[PDB]
Amino acid sequence: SRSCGEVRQIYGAKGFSLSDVPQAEISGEHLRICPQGYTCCTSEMEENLANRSHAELETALRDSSRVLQAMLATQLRSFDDHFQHLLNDSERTLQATFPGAFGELYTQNARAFRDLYSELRLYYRGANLHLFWARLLERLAPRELRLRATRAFVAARSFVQGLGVASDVVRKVAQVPLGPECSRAVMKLVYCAHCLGVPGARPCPDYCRNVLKGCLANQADLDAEWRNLLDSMVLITDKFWGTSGVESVIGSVHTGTLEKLVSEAKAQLRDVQDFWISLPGTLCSERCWNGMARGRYLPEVMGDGLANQINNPEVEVDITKPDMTIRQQIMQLKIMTNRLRSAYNGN
Template structure:
């Protein structure tokens, strides 16, 4: 069930199940209205004690009424406020879920990357000592670029990994032939034949496949969480159209003006009004469900280490 459908169900359930206290349909007194009106936090100044002619009303029926023009305006504003608050509250869990999941995954993946860099650095330092330390920037640059890719940087993974192996080959070739001096053109020529020479065997191909798969999945997943959060934030900020406010006021508060503050709308009526107010959000429903489905599958695959 989508967040917008939950808004509809919750709002209409609350409207129908709200406690209604008696008001005689034939009664001319506005005492019940005054009690309900002040319970909403409004002042009773200029609120009538008895029904009066309602020609001044613009939203509610213009028969005998307990509402002044000011009351009708305030009840319209109250309808809008209650609707906005309900949408905000209902979508809050969804939004906080995206935020917390993004934070946890981001911290987890960056920690994983940092630990990998540290482990490799410690192992190579123990194994090759000063020789590695003098050339460690090749590996440091690799991890810097991997982090930049993951965080949304404009990095071509394939080109970056190819460049890493080319740089590593040039360094090793120079170290193994330290008695000679090689020009940049000569070293560049050597790096061009890396695929044919295969000085590192099949390691570059296997590593490229593993790194590319892992980082594309991680970056796509974390960006999906960010997109979901932004969509949820925007959808939660409902632009309440004047027609929606009128419909909400008629449904929720025009009974006040008729002297029947306890009268509540039927379920179908309430749902129709809510569908109209959430029409724009409802258009997102198919795409949103596809996004959530893909996100759940992605989370499952990553958690399984695929």
């Protein structure tokens, strides 16, 4: 009973000084974060534990963000390269087989055709959205190419650009720092059990979830527009198939790999659609500590988002102060989603 021994054992494996830990429990009136009671932790010990917990949560969030961003980058590069190869090899197919087939009409105008495909590459890159036949006719059905090429290219470009926007939102949101009250609540969640005499106690799941939802609420606001974006990006792949399909059009300009990539992308995107609300449940998964002491955790789990954190017991959140960067990224999501929807619905 009244053991500072085990707390001393744990506190030293964090790298912290073993001189600062008392032999027995002292008066805990001086504790800023932890609820005041008899404790084995001093002020500096408590602060060090706070720093440690904050760094832990930060590290976890960073790692998760790195994983998501890596997946998105891989997908983006993959699809972009596949489309570029599709067009480049359409042009290559035009180079190898054509020269004697179309006669010498092709031989003289070959440079003009190369210029055409180059311009199409410019259209795929979104460099110029304005859309040769005059130059041809002067130097001497196309409207179907005019419609189809647009329909396909805007879809592919919107998909790639969409992945880019997702990656951008993840990356820029990842830079948002945690609040001081969040740090305090996290310290109260994790290492306050050690100070209060129950170092071997595991925190309650609902308690952890309320803390993490309190901290991450702003990030949780991204849910609706993130899901909308991913949904539209799933939908834009429906245009890829058929005689009027995207790949067939991109390949038919002069007149399966993409399928597997689309399936994989579908799986990976369905996996990450829960991302913004998933983090609290994920971290809490990998006779409990309710922050007062060992026992049951009374309060129910809060809903997701900033507004639902107004009554959050473990974290005091100001819902009239939305993070600006988050809302900016929300707008980015809504805009890209609108562009995808427009690209899908025919203009």
